[PDB]
């Protein structure tokens, strides 16, 4: 019955066109198990590995989701930034 917690390891910052490392350690689910992770990366992609690296195109701050659900279905969803300069 309990929703799961994702943990998404923010803030990120990294530069145009270089690869940063997303984290999602920590996230857990009390009474099941996390059957996948879905990341937003703020800038149309997406992904579904647990850790993904991404690169963006241009510089901004980006809003970075993370949206993890559970064996039952149920899920939460976490969000942070990734401020991409120079």
Known sequence: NSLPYGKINGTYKGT???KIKFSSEG???PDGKI???EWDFGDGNK???ENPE???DKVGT???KLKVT???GESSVSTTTAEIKD
């Open 70 to 72: 559970d064996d039952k």
């Open 47 to 49: 992904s579904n590995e």
């Open 27 to 29: 996230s857990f689910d």
């Open 62 to 64: 980006y809003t970075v």
């Open 35 to 37: 059957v996948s992770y």
């Open 16 to 18: 145009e066109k270089e």
């Open 54 to 56: 991404h690169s963006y």
